[PDB]
Amino acid sequence: MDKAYLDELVELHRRLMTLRERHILQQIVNLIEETGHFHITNTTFDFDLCSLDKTTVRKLQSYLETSGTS
């Protein structure tokens, strides 16, 4: 087994594809730029999910959970 990783990535992005918060989206974009791993088009911006690093994926999970002080 090993698809586990990819499984999460898919489930994560899937859940986000349902979100409606644009602000949170902006923050994520920065996360992708931080890992300096992505592909920006001269007329568009796209990035692979299976290309990001553990750090990014981790930050994304925390973003959705946004569970800080309670």
Binding site: L6, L9, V10, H13, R22, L25, Q26, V29, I40, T43, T44, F45, D46, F47, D48, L49, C50
Partner: peptide, 24 residues
């Protein structure tokens, strides 16, 4: 023979995040 290994990629037009495609 007939496996599966699709690439999960997401496209987000900068015109959405940046909000500056070709002005007006």
């Amino acid at each position: 023979t007939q496996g599966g290994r699709p690439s999960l990629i997401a496209r987000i037009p900068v015109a959405r995040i940046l909000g500056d495609p070709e002005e007006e």
